[PDB]
Amino acid sequence: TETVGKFEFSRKDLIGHGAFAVVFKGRHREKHDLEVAVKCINKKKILKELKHENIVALYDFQEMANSVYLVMEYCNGGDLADYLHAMRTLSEDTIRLFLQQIAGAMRLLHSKGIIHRDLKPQNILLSNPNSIRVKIADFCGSPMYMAPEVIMSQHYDGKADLWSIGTIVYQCLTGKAPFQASSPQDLRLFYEKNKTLVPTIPRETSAPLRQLLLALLQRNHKDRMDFDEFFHHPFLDASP
Numbered sequence: 001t002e003t004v005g006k007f008e009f010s011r012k013d014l015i016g017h018g019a020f021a022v023v024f025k026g027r028h029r030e031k032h033d034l035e036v037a038v039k040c041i042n043k044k045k046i047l048k049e050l051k052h053e054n055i056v057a058l059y060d061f062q063e064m065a066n067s068v069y070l071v072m073e074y075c076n077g078g079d080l081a082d083y084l085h086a087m088r089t090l091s092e093d094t095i096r097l098f099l100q101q102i103a104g105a106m107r108l109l110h111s112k113g114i115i116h117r118d119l120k121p122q123n124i125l126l127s128n129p130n131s132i133r134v135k136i137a138d139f140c141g142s143p144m145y146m147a148p149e150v151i152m153s154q155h156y157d158g159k160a161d162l163w164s165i166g167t168i169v170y171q172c173l174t175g176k177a178p179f180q181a182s183s184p185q186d187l188r189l190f191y192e193k194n195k196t197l198v199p200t201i202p203r204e205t206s207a208p209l210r211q212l213l214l215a216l217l218q219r220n221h222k223d224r225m226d227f228d229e230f231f232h233h234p235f236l237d238a239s240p
């Protein structure tokens, strides 16, 4: 049993792996009821006070000489990747409920000038007490969700997250990524050669969802909708 401030965990209770990182299940040393995820980063913020129902809370952190430990809110429902694998696709009404929650979380991050950069289904966690609550984490390996300007090592901004959300919502609607690639290098070459991109949207898609997806899935960030346009898009206020 190891401890970080008022929290404890065993390396036997592995939740997942990230970039040179591992995540263990742990708990409050006093309140064994309060479960946490402990992220151990190998070296090889505002986040602590940043607080939203759709953001995984940071309860504590601890830099050591070669290691960094984050004590995070425990989410019991797995990730969007698992949900999408089970359901294959989601209804527009479920997509809209998911997107309202992501948009709220992203608005707070945009407010504080924070850009996620690696939004993907494995970083969008579900919490069951739809009533499904989504929580964004890490504010791996799959490059399908990275904005073109990111995978081509350019000067990107907040708009990179809008590309990622576009690719996630497209996969929610259709069951597939909009620009599928055997490999990163292929995806990087596809975006290099294709200065224009039109994703194929099923004709049955509602006009507001089609309009939103075309506005997010713009190859060039100058043409991509900005955060305020996304947050207030008519799709997010349309009736079920």
Ligand SMILES: *CCC(=O)Nc1ccc(-c2ccc3[nH]ncc3c2)cc1
Pocket: 015, 016, 017, 018, 019, 023, 036, 037, 056, 072, 073, 074, 075, 076, 122, 123, 125, 137, 138, 140
């Ligand atoms: C980069 C994506 C990935 O597959 N790794 C990963 C693993 C585990 C978490 C995580 C974070 C916070 C949390 N709270 N309860 C459960 C978890 C899991 C995130 C990303």
